[PDB]
Design an enzyme around this catalytic site. Structure first.
Site, short mmCIF file in Angstrom:
data_model
loop_
_atom_site.label_atom_id
_atom_site.label_comp_id
_atom_site.label_asym_id
_atom_site.label_seq_id
_atom_site.Cartn_x
_atom_site.Cartn_y
_atom_site.Cartn_z
N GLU A 149 0.83 -1.24 0.00
CA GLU A 149 0.00 0.00 0.00
C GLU A 149 0.85 1.26 0.00
O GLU A 149 0.62 2.17 0.79
CB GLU A 149 -0.99 -0.04 1.17
CG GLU A 149 -2.01 -1.15 1.01
CD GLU A 149 -2.95 -1.31 2.19
OE1 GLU A 149 -2.92 -0.49 3.12
OE2 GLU A 149 -3.72 -2.31 2.16
N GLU A 258 -5.66 -10.71 -1.82
CA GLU A 258 -6.58 -10.51 -0.68
C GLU A 258 -8.09 -10.48 -1.09
O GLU A 258 -8.90 -9.69 -0.56
CB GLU A 258 -6.20 -9.24 0.11
CG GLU A 258 -4.71 -9.12 0.45
CD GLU A 258 -4.37 -7.85 1.23
OE1 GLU A 258 -3.16 -7.55 1.37
OE2 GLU A 258 -5.29 -7.13 1.70
#
Ligand code: MG
Ligand code: NA
Length: 353
Positions: A149, A258
């Protein structure tokens, strides 16, 4: 009566010619019928939380391996691939990283030359953390989320997330993290940059230019992890396809890391209070979506090596916390092909075929 998931055919076997099938797990989910369902349906796992920086090095020089070890042990027992999540993140990361020698926050340093000192100090702490974590698990990990991220959502300049890491080191921590990871994991280890909303612009474009930059400078990156925290109607299949083809076009492998298919939009409001409050037609809309999605994954299987869900069954998902957050403490999501009792859902039948 939908059947218990141990009584149905393996997702892992269904997709063995295309990609691994993975689950995020906590150490308490590794036995019983949980462990049985895991062994049967998955051939890859990742730690939901136990391999994040604060779970591994909560104080400087103080390493807590027990949870991660259990996960490593489990994958080894069941001949499963193993993803490492994650070497660098801006959350679940211990505060001691970002304090100077006098114990004050590095981000509040106003002396430009003291800020360069803080850059070097932080980068050597990062290096040390990676070095130690990677040494222990270098023989077991099959894919490393080296950074997580690091790209921001808006800002159509470079679009890097201005977390503490960037504020202190600019983009250098990303370079150091990948170079350290390569040095200690081995030349064959597969190093990933992992992120959410990779499917949509400009975030997609920011991530693309960032990996293009790192590849240009000889920084060793092998693939892009698409977290795929997606919804029923968003993003489109063609946006997903365009995204994965774009990163394949840079000589990168893709992984879906994910995956959850939320029953809600963004923000997830209004929410269902309980699982049994969810109408059957939503489960059928989720199944339709899953079908389209896995047809796309199969279509792209030359450039897609692994598909991991961010959980096992609907009894445990981080999307409950988000649902609860935007609905005054009350809310259940249901993003998987298995329900809270480990029974198959309509979505399961639509991706096993
Ligand atoms: Mg299907
Ligand atoms: Na593949």
């Amino acid at each position: 009566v939908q059947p218990f998931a141990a009584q149905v055919a393996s997702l892992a076997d269904r997709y063995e010619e295309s990609f691994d099938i993975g689950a995020a797990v906590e150490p308490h989910q590794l036995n019983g019928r949980q462990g049985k369902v895991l062994k049967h349906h998955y051939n890859s796992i990742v730690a939901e939380n136990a391999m994040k920086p604060i779970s591994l090095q909560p104080e400087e020089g103080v390493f807590t391996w027990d949870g991660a070890d259990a996960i490593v042990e489990f994958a080894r027992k069941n001949n499963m691939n193993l993803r490492f999540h994650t070497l660098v993140w801006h959350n679940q990361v211990p505060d001691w990283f970002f304090l100077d020698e006098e114990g004050n926050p590095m981000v509040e340093e106003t002396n430009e030359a003291k800020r360069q000192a803080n850059k070097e100090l932080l980068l050597e702490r990062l290096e040390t953390h990676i070095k130690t974590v990677v040494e222990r698990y270098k023989d077991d990990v099959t894919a490393w989320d080296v950074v997580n991220e690091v790209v921001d959502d808006g800002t159509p300049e470079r679009g890097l997330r201005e977390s503490v890491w960037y504020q202190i080191t600019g983009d250098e921590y990303i370079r150091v993290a990948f170079e350290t990871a390569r040095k200690y994991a081995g030349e064959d280890a597969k190093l990933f940059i992992n992120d959410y909303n990779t499917e949509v612009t400009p975030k997609r474009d920011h991530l693309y230019n960032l990996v293009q930059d790192l590849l240009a400078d000889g920084v060793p990156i092998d693939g892009v992890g698409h977290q795929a925290h997606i919804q029923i109607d968003w993003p489109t299949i063609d946006e997903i396809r365009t995204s994965m083809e774009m990163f394949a076009g840079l000589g990168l492998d893709n992984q879906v890391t994910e995956l959850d298919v939320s029953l809600y939009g963004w923000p997830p409001r209004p929410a269902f209070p309980t699982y049994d409050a969810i109408p059957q037609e939503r489960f059928q809309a989720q199944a339709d979506r899953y079908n389209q999605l896995f047809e796309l994954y199969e279509e792209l299987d030359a450039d897609l090596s692994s598909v991991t869900f961010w959980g096992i069954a609907d009894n445990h998902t981080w999307l409950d916390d988000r649902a609860r957050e935007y609905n005054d403490g009350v809310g259940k999501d249901a993003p998987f092909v298995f329900d809270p009792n480990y029974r198959v859902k309509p979505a399961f039948w639509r991706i096993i075929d």
